Structures are given as structure tokens and as C-alpha cells.
Amino acid sequence: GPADCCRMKECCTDRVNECLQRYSGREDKFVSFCYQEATVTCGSFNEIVGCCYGYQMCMIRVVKPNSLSGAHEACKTVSCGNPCA
Amino acid sequence: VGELVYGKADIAIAPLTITLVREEVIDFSKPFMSLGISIMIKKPQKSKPGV
Amino acid sequence: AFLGVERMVSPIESAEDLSKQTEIAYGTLDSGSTKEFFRRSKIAVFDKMWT
Amino acid sequence: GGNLDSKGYGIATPKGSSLGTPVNLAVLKLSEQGVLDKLKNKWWYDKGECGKTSALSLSNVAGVFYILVGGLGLAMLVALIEF
Amino acid sequence: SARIVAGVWWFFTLIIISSYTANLAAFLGVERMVSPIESAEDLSKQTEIAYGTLDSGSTKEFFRRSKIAVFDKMWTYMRSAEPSVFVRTTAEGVARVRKSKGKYAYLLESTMNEYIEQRKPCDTMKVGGNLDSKGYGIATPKGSSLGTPVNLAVLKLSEQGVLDKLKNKWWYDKGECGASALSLSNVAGVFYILVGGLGLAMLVALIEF
Amino acid sequence: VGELVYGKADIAIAPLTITLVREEVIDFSKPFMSLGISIMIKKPQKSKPGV
Amino acid sequence: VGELVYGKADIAIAPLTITLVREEVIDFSKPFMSLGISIMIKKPQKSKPGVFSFLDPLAYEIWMAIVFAYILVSVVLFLSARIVAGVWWFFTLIIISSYTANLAAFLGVERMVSPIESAEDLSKQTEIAYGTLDSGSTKEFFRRSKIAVFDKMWT
Amino acid sequence: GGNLDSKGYGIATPKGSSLGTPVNLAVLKLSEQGVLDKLKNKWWYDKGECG
Ligand SMILES: CC(C)S(=O)(=O)NC[C@H](C)c1ccc(-c2ccc([C@@H](C)CNS(=O)(=O)C(C)C)cc2)cc1
């Protein structure tokens, strides 16, 4: 049962986004929470790194309250970086 | 941590270890005390000389 | 030889020595930051210890 | 001796900068992953040039030489009080 | 009067002979001392003794591509260290081991090590076990007709002991290097002063009579 | 390996170490000799201790 | 091997020794483990020091030399004597001290004796019986071996 | 004493099976990565009951 890469990534972004949709206006505050849950649901090659790290960082630095949709739409294509380190 | 996230407590003061997993959910103040994972064993008996 | 044997022997120095011997069992708490540290650890020695 | 006080260094960022939290989480990750430790060991200790002895000491015997000369002194004393 | 003289001198010579005995015990302990390097790991743990591999080949690449801790650290050291610890040829590396007064260690395959260890001047040796376990082989282009016959042939030679006999032929048989305590030399001096003392004794015995 | 791949030689017989990188490009026969990465130093000399 | 040839199994993972006869019918992956036919016996009780462990810390050369030195000093005294007794005392002092120290370095060996140091020695003696499994690559090796020693052992 | 002969074990696959080459490359990768070594050390030595 391999987790591949891309499937894991698209899962990661999708779960992060879907999670952040639940918190309206607090979106910028809960990015790490939703990333945690997303890393749990989609699994990770490195527990510390998470499903997609670069996406997480992109979201954290970009996402502002109520700015969720555009921010995510911009951040989901970004390079995830090294999944093992 | 749970009480903090779900708002059953306004602050948490205790020997709470700072971890990235906890830093993601909560906010940690600068460390008020320093520590590290260490090893504890039983000290050897000094002497049992006899003749 | 006796007097030599008394002082010469060192029971334990560091965690690595714990990793290298099966004679002295060792462990942590059922939960908390230490166990989780060992679990998530990709560092050789701690990995071995966790296993 | 020990340290007078216990404090630490840190990466500093302007208040309300977007970089602050990413930098912080990065430092935590590096800490737990052991990156900080290995880095410090790299620069401080690893290339450290400063790093049991089977050899002779003339000094240990000196005391007994002193007690010998003292004994000979007392010997001269007795030799004198006799004559 | 003379009693305390004899006593003090006796105590003095007592502590001195005891101390001599003990220190000598320490020196013989020094010769008894083992394990300067017992493992690959020890080279990783000490910076005093430099070590290296060939400029290219399977060993260097093994270290480069290795993700396991010790060898990784070793690779880091080797790549970063100056002057270069890498040598062009095997003979150059061995020569470096010989010239370095034991300050340089050479990482090379078990075969070459055993062979050079069996060759004069016989000043070199292999320490500890092997880092990895692998083998040589006869190589053939993919999809060649020779592959299976060659393979079955190598198997035949293996079971027949031809390979073994061959290695024994080239390695050990032609080898020029060949196959506890109580140093006599140290005592020889005290024997010499003994004979000298007896000589002086004969001298006095003659001058008296 | 190159001479073999580009067909300038039909076979290669030499102390060629079996590696995954080489096994991917060419075909290796079963190993005719066993070896491993090892450490070589200069043997110490206790000769001529003297008086 | 049979299950493999007749298609009752798609793959074989086991301590299966690579042999030419099996390599002819089947395909062997590169060897995942290295081994060889070896000899197993019951570990002996420690051989005990014996009396020679006493003559170990002082080489035979030192004993012969100290005897010749002894009789030489004796024949010197036979023919002033103060320096003889003094030099001899110094000599025996250095020797007993050196022996004490070296003995300390020597301690016990506590090494057991080995009845048979190699395969051939089993071929040379009928006292210790030896054998292999009822089947498998080892027995087959002994059977087909054209080498003198192994031939004798198989016989 | 030493060994009488030098040989090895192996994974066996039917001639012309599709699994053969994947299995082979897998064994090679495991070899270089030290998985085989670690495995033997796991089952043979690490739990070793003698000394
Ligand atoms: C049947 C014979 C041709 S033989 O047994 O294969 N070769 C005889 C020759 C003495 C020999 C015997 C055994 C080995 C040998 C060497 C290493 C290993 C294991 C530890 C690693 N496997 S590997 O194939 O070398 C690796 C690189 C994947 C297993 C076997 C290498 C060479």
C-alpha cells in the first residue's frame, strides 16, 4: 500500500483547505491546526515534515482572514519541498 | 492543551514541554525553565568491605 | 587486578551505551513529550532505542 | 565554574511581519530534528583541536628523599649527643 | 644511632622498590593495551587519524550514496577535509599509509587489503571487520548469449573449488609475509651490570691476595 | 562497463564490484569472489626496545 | 525447487543454497546472505592454567640465564664479597619486581583448548565421529567433491 | 575453524518469470542500504543469549 507523492500532496492541500473552510475569519489562525489534521488524514513520509510542507508555509505566510479561497487557490500548486527531511 | 484550544481555560502554567506539535495549536511563551531528556539509574553501593 | 577492576569499570556514560547493551533494560513514560520524541525520531541512536 | 545566568539567542523579526511564525516553526523543527545540535557540533567541537599517562615522575619520590635527609639529620643529632 | 639510619634507609628503599614495581606494571600494561582502532565507527569518532578512499570507484560512491549514519559522517569528513584524503591509485594509497607513520588510514576492498598485507615489506595490516558485504563478478552486455553459459561456468568453478584454489594460488602461496610477555632485552642490562659487578669482585679478590 | 554497453567488448573479466548502478546497465554473473570495504593501517613495531 | 518448476509456487524465499544443479533449472537472485559449510562441536571446559602458566610471565631464556647467573655468582663467591652480595641483591630485586609486574599484566588466560583447528584434522582421526544432514547441499557437496580431503570424509 | 566452502543463499524464481529482475534489483538495493545486514543482526546477534 504505497502512498505515492502526488496523491498525498493533493490530499494534503484538499484536507487543509476543507478544514480551513470550517473556520471563517479565523482562517489565518488555524492554518497549522488544519495542516496537522491534514497530515494525519493523508499520512506523511516524515511525521515532522507533514504531507506538504511548502504548501503549509505558503498558506501561513499568505492567508489573511476571509482571504481563504484566493490564498489556497494560489498556494495549492506550490512545491512541497523535501518530504523526507 | 485541550482546555486551552476549546476555551475551558485562559492560560496554562505547568511543566509543559515545548513541542512543534503543541506550538502549532497553542502559543508558547519564551521558556521559563530549561530541560532535556536524561537518564536515571540506581547509584552503586559505596563499600561492603568485610575482612 | 582487584584494585584495577574496582575503579576501571564504567556502568554507563551516555544513551548510546544504553543502545549498545541488552543487559540493562530502559524505558520512558506511557505518554508525554519524551515518548513522542523517541517515536518521531529519525536519529540513529534514538531510533534504535525506540525500536 | 558554572554560568552566571541562563538565557538564549534568537532570530529576530519586525513586529507584525509575515515571516515571524514561519521562522519560529522552522526553528522548532530544526531543534527537534537535531539540526541545531549537529550544526553546533559541526562548528564548535568536530574540528576542535584541543581534544592515561605512563611516564616517570621525579616528584613523588622527593618527599621520601626529604624524610630520608631528615632521618640522617636526626642521625647526626644522636651521633653528636652521644659523643 | 645507626639503628634509625638503617630503619630510615630501609623504609626509603622499600617505597622506592615498591614504586618501581608498580610503574613497571603500568608499562607492561601499556604493551598489554589493545584496540587503538577496533571499528569503522572509531574513525568517525576521532579527528586525529585522517583516512580516505580512491578518487573514484565503488567505495567512494558507496560512501557518497550511503544514508546510514557512521558512513555518512565519514563521507562528510572526507569530502570536507584538506588536503585531499583521496588517492589516484591503490599503490599511492598504500604508500601514503606507509609514509604517514600510522597517521593515515586507507579504506579499500578486503581483497586488495589481504593481498598487500601478504606482500613485502609487510608493514601494513587490516583492522576490524568489513564495512559492507559484497562480491566481484563477470560482466556481460544485457541480452548477450554468453550470460547464462558464463554464469553456469562460474557456478561450476565455485563448486569445484577452482576459485578457492585460484585465490590461494595468487594471494597466499606467493605471499612473502609468511603465516606473549617477559622481554629478555630489558633484563639483559641488569645481567650486564651483574657480570660487571662480578668482574670488579674478581679484581678486588686479586688485589687483596 | 562502457566498452560493454557500447559494444566494443563482448565480456568483462576483472575485479569489478557488483553495484546496483552497474546491475541496472549491464548483467552480472553470480559473484566469483567475496569482499567488503575494509580499513588499512601501518603495523606497529615493538622491535629493538633496548636497555 | 519442484514447486517452482511445476508452477505450484511463483517465488521461493528461504535459506536456499545456490547450486549449479538448481541454477540450471531455476533462476537465482543475487545472494542475499553469505555462508559456508562449517564445523560445530561442544565447547570444552577451560583447559586450566597448568604449571606452565607460571613459566609464562618469565621466558625460559630468563630462567636459563638466571640459573647460569646464579652459578656464576656462586663460583665468584667461591674465590670483596660485599659488592657481590650487593650486586646480586640488586639483580634479584629487579628480577622479582619485573616478574611481579609482568605477572600482573599476564593475569589469567582462561582460554579453552580446541580439539580440531580445521576440516582436514577430522579426516585424520577416527576418534571423533562427524556427520551432516540426511539431505541438502552439504551432503551433496561431500558426495560430488573431487577434492582429496572431502572425498575421504564422505567415504 | 574456518569454512569448507564459500557460497550464498538466494531468492528463487521460475525461468522466464516477470518477477525475477524486480526481485534481483530489490535484493541489490536492500544490500547497499544495509537492510540485509540490519536484518541478520536483528535475528542473529541483537537478541543473542550468549554473553
Ligand atoms: C554460486 C557461486 C558462483 S557464489 O556463491 O555466488 N560465489 C562464490 C564466491 C566465493 C562468493 C560467495 C559468496 C558471496 C556473497 C557475498 C555477499 C553476500 C551478501 C552478504 C550480499 N549480497 S551480494 O550479492 O554480494 C550484493 C552485491 C547484492 C552473499 C554472498 C560472494 C562471492
Ligand SMILES: C=C(C)[C@H]1CN[C@H](C(=O)O)[C@H]1CC(=O)O
Ligand atoms: C511529567 C509529565 C507527564 C510531563 C512533564 N513534561 C512532559 C510533557 O510536557 O509532556 C511529560 C513527561 C515526559 O513525557 O517526559
Ligand SMILES: C=C(C)[C@H]1CN[C@H](C(=O)O)[C@H]1CC(=O)O
Ligand atoms: C581497484 C579499483 C579501482 C576498483 C576495484 N573494485 C572497485 C570497483 O569495482 O569500482 C574499485 C575499487 C574501489 O572503488 O574501492
Ligand SMILES: C=C(C)[C@H]1CN[C@H](C(=O)O)[C@H]1CC(=O)O
Ligand atoms: C536445512 C536444510 C536441509 C537445508 C538448508 N540449507 C541447505 C540447502 O539449502 O540445501 C540444507 C542444509 C544442508 O545441506 O546442510
